[PDB]
Amino acid sequence: LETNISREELLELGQAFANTPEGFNYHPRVAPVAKKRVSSVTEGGIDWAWGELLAFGSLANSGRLVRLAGEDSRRGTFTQRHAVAIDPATAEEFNPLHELAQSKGNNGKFLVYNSALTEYAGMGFEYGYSVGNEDSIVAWEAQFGDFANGAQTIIDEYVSSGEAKWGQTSKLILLLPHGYEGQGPDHSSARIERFLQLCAEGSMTVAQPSTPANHFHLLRRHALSDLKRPLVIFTPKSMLRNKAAASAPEDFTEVTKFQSVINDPNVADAAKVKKVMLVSGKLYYELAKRKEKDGRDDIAIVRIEMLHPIPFNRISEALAGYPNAEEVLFVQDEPANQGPWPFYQEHLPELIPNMPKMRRVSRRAQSSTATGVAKVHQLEEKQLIDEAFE
Amino acid sequence: ANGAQTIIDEYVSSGEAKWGQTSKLILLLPHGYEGQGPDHSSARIERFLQLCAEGSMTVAQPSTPANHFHLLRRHALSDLKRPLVIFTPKSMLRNKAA
Amino acid sequence: VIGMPHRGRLNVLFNIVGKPLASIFNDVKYHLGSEGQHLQMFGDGEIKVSLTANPSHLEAVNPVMEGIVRAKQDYLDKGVDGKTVVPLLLHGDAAFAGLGIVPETINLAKLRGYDVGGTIHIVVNNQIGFTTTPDSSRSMHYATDYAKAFGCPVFHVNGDDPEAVVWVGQLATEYRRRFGKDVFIDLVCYRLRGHNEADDPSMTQPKMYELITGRETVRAQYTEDLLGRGDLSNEDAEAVVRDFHDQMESVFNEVKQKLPHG
Amino acid sequence: TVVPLLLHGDAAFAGLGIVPETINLAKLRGYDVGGTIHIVVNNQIGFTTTPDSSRSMHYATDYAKAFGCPVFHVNGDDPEAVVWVGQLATEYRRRFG
Ligand SMILES: Cc1ncc(C[n+]2csc(CCOP(=O)(O)OP(=O)(O)O)c2C)c(N)n1
Ligand SMILES: Cc1ncc(C[n+]2csc(CCOP(=O)(O)OP(=O)(O)O)c2C)c(N)n1
Ligand SMILES: [Mg+2]
Ligand SMILES: [Mg+2]
């Protein structure tokens, strides 16, 4: 299945943020975001929020009903989405991607709502939407993935187990912000370990993409396929505005499929690498920065974009490309009893028998998810990257 | 008990590490695979053991009434101010060999 | 015993619980618990004041705080006419109406093993929740409408009239001691700044923030109101302002587990 | 034109917080469905627990007064009165949403 969009369709989507209705003007802090969306589709520098909206928008143009709901989801928790803009003078609302979809002639819709302060009812409502209309694309977003434990009954009893129990399928998308940035125990972990503990028989797809274009292709592959199973995506916070994370337009128009594993872009000679680091998420960019600063041509950093199912064939192909590798390190921000390490330490060695013994590099095991002191977090992050390289 | 996940994650399993606040709460959670279905079989042991680190809480599944007696009494008469999670039985309540 | 979220927590620690400035300042502080004492200026009564620890998950402290109160009441053991540990529980308007744990905990108020003589609820109703307005937060007329389900009274009071606010506080505490039931105070106020540091609240709510930006504070408005009606003299009004600057100057420079072996 | 008919038990309706948390979505823009017809099979017991230990509300259905909605308590041993209440409740939902 090819998930790329035409160059013409990409420019049309970008031009929707310029087709403002008669007598409508943006708020001056939202105006440069809209202006960058029109420039990005030819120049590049496409951020996470725009990569995600390019996917929801393209699907609505084909004729689908796209529904996105969550706390403060119109503007976005991190002031990044602006799917609905408001004129400060008249309080008039504008939804550019919905209007473009309605003008294509296939009755496509892009519906974005601000939910009430609820997780149990909120998520439950969106799971129900997916069951009442198989052909809709539905996404529930949490303020922070840490608050999804207040909807545990819906995760355990419907989303992760519905097909096995009753033969009832769903295509619900869970957008759960996750990332260790020093914001405390309730603003750092979406509990990846818990979601991977509920996975078996390919029950649901779990992913942590690192580039806006890969998130675009993941959402589009899920929507255009007949694999009627949920999609759990661990979305970023600081990586939303990282300049090294942005994508070029060719990543949406020339790149045809979603990538399970992304090989290292900065490798001069593959025969000289001796260490191989496996990582997943925003931590890649920090590790890559350190590799350039120190000039380490003996290390290779490979990203695992899809966590479940385990893309063991693509990981095997990547490790085969470095024939003089002596050790394989699994590097993550999360504590030793959390994150994707517990799942991968059990299953990856049995799926790739010739791979060397994996060595963990992470934060120490903890009762809580993360420290409450920001200075302690920065010290732990330095210790983590130092341990990986030495 | 998954309808009380916020209390398990944010208070019982993490309170001492986060704020230095201790508790000696006993959770009595019936568990056992006896054929009563998906909502009458597992207390999700794997989830409780995923939250354990630094001896945060004591987790046990006793097999004899006397051992359950000694576990409850050791917890109460000790100065180890940490929670106790016990996976209690259903059919084993009336097994003559137990 | 107080249960509350982050908004105004350090203010409550200094002016209500009575902790010294040096102890407060040495986001961890925004989740810890504390203890203090309250003496009355016009009386000879004393009362202990406690603050309970809580996570960032809003309203999760509600059942925990009630349980803390019941344990302290059982240890004193004063019977049916006792119930001398008062639960003072603070909420936000979006969280009070939206999260189900709020009415689930209030359902325990009259039950045999959970009764604590009633809870005083204060909803800081600033008519906003991050970027969400009440039209998308609740299907209830007022935020505090779960009170009508439990047969409890509600007092909606204007946050810019401090005389009416202190009266409601007294009446609600008098009602709790006489009837032993929950009481709900809806403090109708506003939120002056955005939800976080990097947020322009006029981006999403421009019309509401036309009325908020550049208005007199509750302190300044009340001083000017008393001086206008003749309730404060010109000389007496100048002293209140000098006292406000004195309180600021003083606060600003306030720098000077083992196993049972055997 | 799709009517939600939701059945509950008296102990569960009063006790579990998801009940009023879901009813709070009834008038919201992205969640409105024209009203829900709720039936509480109030058999005045919940396993071995009586209403005196199940709720601090006079009636099991008292979350209705929070949302400004009408309540009809009907005697389950008078089937004429039960069918009348069913009709009136469905007529009220179509007229007021
Ligand atoms: C259970 C839970 N869900 C979501 C959040 C995210 N969150 C933090 S503040 C906030 C809005 C709070 O609104 P309101 O209750 O009116 O409080 P205010 O900030 O206006 O005092 C939200 C949704 C949270 N902290 N806890
Ligand atoms: C969330 C949840 N908690 C607990 C139970 C256990 N349980 C099963 S039936 C029951 C009592 C139900 O009482 P009521 O709602 O009055 O229903 P009735 O059986 O009287 O129709 C309980 C507690 C459950 N099934 N679900
Ligand atoms: Mg508010
Ligand atoms: Mg019943």
* Residues C148, D56: C-beta atoms closer than 8 Å: no
**SS3 of A61, please?**
helix
Answer whether B80 sits within 8 Å of C257, measured CB to CB: yes
Angle made by CA atoms D11, C98, C107, in degrees to the nearest 5: 30
| Interatomic CA distance for residues B14 and B57, integer angstroms | 9
Contact C149 D62 (CB under 8 A): yes
Whether B37 lines ligand 2, by a CB cut-off of 6 Å, is no
Q: Do A120 and D25 touch (CB under 8 A)?
A: no
Virtual torsion, Cα C46, C52, C58, C64, nearest 10 deg: -100
Is D25 near ligand 2, meaning CB less than 6 Å away?
Answer: no
- What separation in Å is there between the alpha carbon of D12 and the centre of ligand 4? 8
In angstroms, rounded to a whole number, what is the distance separating the alpha carbons of residues B30 and D12? 20
Is A70 in contact with A142 (CB distance < 8 Å)?
Answer: yes
Tell me which architecture the domain covering C1-253 has in CATH: 3-Layer(aba) Sandwich (3.40)
Q: DSSP character for B95?
A: -
Residue of C98, C108, C113 lying closest to D24 (CB–CB): C98
Which candidate, B10, D8, C64, places its Cα nearest to that of A152? B10
Q: What is the C-alpha separation between A251 and A243, in angstroms, rounded?
A: 16
Read off φ and ψ for residue A226, nearest 5 degrees. Answer: -100, 20
Judge if the beta carbon of residue D47 lies within 6 A of ligand 2: yes
Q: Going by C-beta distance under 8 Å and a sequence separation of 6 or more, which residues neighbour residue A151?
A: A119, A120, A122, A123, A124
Q: Does A186 touch chain C (CB under 8 A)?
A: yes
Burial of A318 per CB tally in 10 Å (0-12, 13-18, 19+): buried
CB-CB contact of A179 with A239 (8 Å): yes
Of D28, D56, D62, which is closest to C110 when you measure between CB atoms? D56
The residue of chain B nearest to residue A368, with distances taken between CA atoms, is B14
Q: SS3 for C158? A: strand
Q: Cβ–Cβ of A121/D22 closer than 8 Å?
A: yes
Longest dimension (CA), chain A: 66
Measured in angstroms, the resolution is: 2.5
B39 touches chain A (CB under 8 A): yes
Are the CB atoms for D32 and D23 separated by under 8 Å? no
Pocket of ligand 1 (CB under 6 A): A 71, 117, 143, 147, 150; C 7, 56-58, 92-95, 124, 126, 128-130, 191
Instruction: Count CA within 13 A, CB hemisphere, residue A37.
Output: 26
Task: State the Cα–Cα distance between residues D97 and D93, nearest whole angstrom.
Answer: 5
Burial (Cβ within 10 Å: 0-12, 13-18, ≥19) of residue A47: buried
Residue A58 · residue A13 · CB < 8 Å: yes
The label of the residue with tokens 């059919």 reads B91
D88, D90, D91, D97: CA torsion to nearest 10: 130
φ, ψ dihedrals at C89, nearest 5°? -110, 120
Q: Give the integer Cα–Cα distance in Å for A55 and A376.
A: 38
- Collect all residues with Cβ–Cβ distance below 8 Å to A223 and sequence separation of at least 6: A55, A59, A64, A137, A171
Whether A231 and A171 have beta carbons less than 8 Å apart is answered as yes
Structure determined by: X-ray
Q: What residues contact residue A44 under an 8 Å CB cut-off, 6+ apart?
A: A246, A247, A248, A249
Which residue from C minimizes the CA distance to B7?
C60
Q: Are the C-beta atoms of A318 and A370 separated by less than 8 Å?
A: no
How far does C47 lie from chain A, in Å, by closest CA?
32
The residue of chain C with its CA nearest to that of B24 is C257
Beta bridge partners of C2: C51, C88
Consecutive H or E run containing A3: none
Closest by Cβ to C103, choosing from D29, D53, D63: D63
Task: Determine whether the shortest distance from the Cβ of D15 to ligand 2 is under 6 A.
Answer: no
Question: ∠ at Cα A39 (A38, A43), nearest 5°?
Answer: 140
Strands B84-88, B26-30: parallel, antiparallel or unpaired by DSSP?
parallel
Tokens coding A163: 């097909």
Q: Which residues of C touch B (CB under 8 A)?
A: 31-33, 53, 55, 57, 60, 63-64, 101, 257-260
